[PDB]
Design a protein around this ligand. Structure first.
Ligand SMILES: *[C@@H]1O[C@H](CO)[C@@H](O)[C@H](O)[C@H]1NC(C)=O
Lengths: 29, 21
């Protein structure tokens, strides 16, 4: 839950993710 | 669904809240 503008970046609703990109397709997780 | 909408419109430091999966 941190809008990491004060610290590959993708922003989820659970926070921001660093180190992982975003993929259009979906698979069982 | 309309019943789902009617149900939805009836229920209202250091302590974070994790979002559901
Ligand atoms: C993070 O901050 C920017 C600018 O303050 C805002 O536009 C953006 O919506 C914020 N992120 C989220 C997930 O709300």
């Amino acid at each position: 839950g941190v809008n990491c503008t004060e610290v590959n970046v993708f922003q989820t609703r659970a926070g921001c993710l660093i180190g992982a990109e975003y993929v259009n397709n979906s698979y069982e997780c | 669904s309309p019943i789902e909408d009617l149900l939805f419109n009836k229920v209202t430091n250091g302590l974070t809240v994790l979002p559901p999966l």
